[model samples]
Target: TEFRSADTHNADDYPTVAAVKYMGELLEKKSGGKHKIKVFNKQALGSEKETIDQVKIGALDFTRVNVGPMNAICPLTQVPTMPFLFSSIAHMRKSLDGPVGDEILKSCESAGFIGLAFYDSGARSIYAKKPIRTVADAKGLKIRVQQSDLWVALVSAMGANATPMPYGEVYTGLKTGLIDAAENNIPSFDTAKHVEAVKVYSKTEHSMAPEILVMSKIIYDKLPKAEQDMIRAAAKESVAFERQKWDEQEAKSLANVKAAGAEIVEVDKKSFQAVMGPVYDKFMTTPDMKRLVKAVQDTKA
Candidate 1:
């Protein structure tokens, strides 16, 4: 019923997988056999992009995919992928659950998929083999980035070379010097062994990686209204569950990376912010999407 995969070791270790699994388990238990959502983990289905394709074609009923895959299909989804888009998790929820989030869901639905909910993919930051203490330190550094114009622009805006590589090939790319740096949330960096390859984590907190649990609009429309609501409620609960686990995971990951001898670099994002200013000012005002930027800037955090 649902397919979930991460660019990592297993379902338990990644926030997106754990979050979707939590929803599947809850749907089964709460519905008591009247409804059940099957989960496919560990690339059992395919990569994020492939899984989204499957969901679109009716080969898959539902899937949890990273925002990167939706970049083209749902450019609005790329709103979160924009650097430092969300202020905090709570603010993210408010923005996503509001009109802006509804617009994304509608866009996905119009494009043939039903966007049910969003699960936290944690905050994405930079990790590199060489010390990246400041913006000047990273100039000309080839960083592996998700395949999206926003990411490419973000990397370029920060004065780094943006290399779009598959998530699975990151470590080898790092080891072979094909790429000097990469970005990810702390857990992904840890699980994908990117932390070992690149020992410095520059915590820019540039983006809150977002994973959407999406289903085929055709399949979703066929389900009984009650069944659909049940799935939605379970998914909401799962988001909360995953957020709790993420708090623990984030803390443990920071400790783990530190223990491994990576120098944690804290950057003054003002410079990075300045680079992104043109992008924000130019396109950030799109009808429903502007709310996210507004929400983040207004938030105290």
Candidate 2:
């Protein structure tokens, strides 16, 4: 029998979900249809935090989670998530698809999770109920962030009150005036309907936190060598497939947001990165982290 995993993206909307489905197809084909994988989307299994624990214990076979949760298990995963870490999508991919990314992936094995592939989460930007054309404009605004201290520090350094809330509560938080702004990718901004409540989206693009396709190390250890190879190969193929879909959806989502009358403004990113210097100093206190950051910066496009 095959195993299953979960994702937060709905089946139809996100590339990670599509990539997992493609991986299943490839697995079935390679295993003569005897091996099949199942995917549950939209947190059908549970949140990334919950599923990560499940996968580690062999209760779940696989999961798609952001780098934030993995930081608890594999601290090196936080290296690439630092604000302005990658110059662009190409730069991020070059680093991730190369030796630097592999070293980080290897770090997961000690934590009982096997890293498969990195999927695009898109460049995250700040969207707010009011215009945020400048860093000064962002000051003192209550902004929603993911459940990570680095995220909190990032927003706080920029002078925003980082409000960490459950993902499902963000819309109500924005609507009820609980949060003045939030940051996320263009696709998430549109798909989550943030455009309706947050009328302004400043193209801060501060960070690009890639999603990881991870499997339980315990379950993987039980697989035969051929099955292991097939799974890894399928995952690599899925990265290309997912990236193509992600690029398309991202463009469409931006258009949709514009059509919905959300003002998309490009802010001066240098000013934003400047404020994040202290955030960097606070998180990159370890020798490994300092080396990892330097290596990632050295990666060529």
Candidate 3:
């Protein structure tokens, strides 16, 4: 039988989509005509949440998604998304490619997914009018965040009022003074052209949440041991290709924004990180989460 995979990124060349297709190619070559992946892209199946539900129920075979909502499925997934948890991209990749990553991925099996691979979503920092050099500067600013409690808790803990809005609106919000700041990776900020209104891209680099690919446990459990192993191996290999693409895009975006006169500011990371204790307490009520957090910290860079 053919395989069904879903990704929301419309662009065929987008790093995550390309990586998923690469996994499909590897699966095709290794399986010797036994399996092939037919990817439905650009929200063809649905949005991330809808596709996630389908995968859980076996309506879809696989999906690529950010670990944003996956935290609810398995809190161990929360460690990678924790603000300032990863010191740098080097540290983040090492942990994800190591034992700790496998542990976090496996934790979702009980919830009906076989977490396949991790992709870099980059460390998200804030973009705004003024350089947010310290916590005092961040306070009282209304920063827009994704409609997740974690983000609300994060910006709130930083002493800013968190405005929850799905972004393009953020462009207008910033121009209209509805928002004082917005957060994203450099590439995303440049691509969205928020650099027009708000001239500073601060280096808060708060969240380094990784994207993931997961197969429905319902489909995965039914596969032969050999096929299962093949799929897992291909998924892991897709990471290197995805990481290269992501970094290339990051560099290009950095240059474009710099050309556009976007000022990149380095901030007091520790001051902002210091306020995240309650955010941890809010989400890490369980022993598993605490252990996972410690494990990530203990991992060698």
Candidate 4:
């Protein structure tokens, strides 16, 4: 699984780890212990980008990766990262656990991959040395992100300098004054101790992240059809387990980050979203993206 980075202080408690662990249990129980898959935590093999590359070439059987890197390969996947796509946890859960989710899964399948399932990592907000409570507040600061064009445009619209970087280097980047800020879900900021270097946490919740589960298409097809079915089932069960755990951890995580010397900021998200109003028009003009946007919007939560 993509456990952020190699030196993540709390790798064991990461959502990816929790999801993979729970799925491993269900895979064993449901399969009567006939098949067991080992999860490599902390990117022992490499980072999220490397893992995705390996999966494409059949070098890795499975690797949990972030949506930003995947956007380059599947531009349509960018639909989910569009600012304010989901308003609440329930909204996200129902949408992704249903038809909209299926559409995205099929998109990946056509791109030489078998997208097993999506595990919600929670809502992504922004953290900085200064509080970002307004669109103008975010202007000009170098903020770390996973590198999606939509993210770049939105951050630019918010007036900040978006700095794309690997998760492993973020904490130190903040400590050493390389980046003025970074964006992540609350759990990630808390688990990674990014708050130590950056004192402001804003509940922007601009985008919801669902960790993409992928496997080597070549390797997946080589398996018995029954094994393939088992793998898909295991992945679905894992997403369920992780979403529940994420819901449970939200309150404490927000509180803990504040207690640890971070100031929590609440911004008018609609105001920020307004700045990116042209984004939808721009992205949708692409014939392919037009179809994708409609697919996700047509979905009922």
> What are the clashing pairs of model 4?
139-159
TM-score of each: 0.90, 0.96, 0.90, 0.91
Worst 10 residues of 2 by lDDT: 8-17
Order the candidates by TM-score, highest first.
2, 4, 1, 3
Candidate No. with top TM-score: 2
lDDT of 1 at 220: 75
How many clashes would you count in candidate 3?
0
What's the CA error at residue 98 for candidate 1, in Å?
A: 3.9
Winning candidate number (lDDT): 2
Summarize candidate 1's per-residue lDDT along 1-301 as a digit string, tens digits.
Answer: 4433233234455666667777778887867766666566666777777778888887888887778768778767877777767767777877776766667766777788888787777778888866666678778988998877777777777789998866777888998888888998887887777887889888777777587878787677887888888877887778778778778888888788888888888888766666777666654667666765665456553
The window of 10 residues in a row where model 3 has the poorest summed lDDT is 163-172
Better of 2 and 4 by lDDT: 2
For model 3 the local lDDT of residue 258 reads 97
Model 3 over residues 127-239: C-alpha lDDT tens digits?
88888888888888889986567778878888888887754477788889888889888866876678888989989888998888999999999999999999999899999
Model 1 alpha-carbon drift over 4 Å, by segment:
1-13, 281-285, 295-301
- C-alpha lDDT score of every prediction, in listed order: 0.75, 0.86, 0.85, 0.75
Comparing 3 with 4 on TM-score, the higher-scoring candidate is: 4
Extract clashing residue pairs from model 1. Answer: 84-206
Each candidate's number of clashing pairs is 1, 0, 0, 1
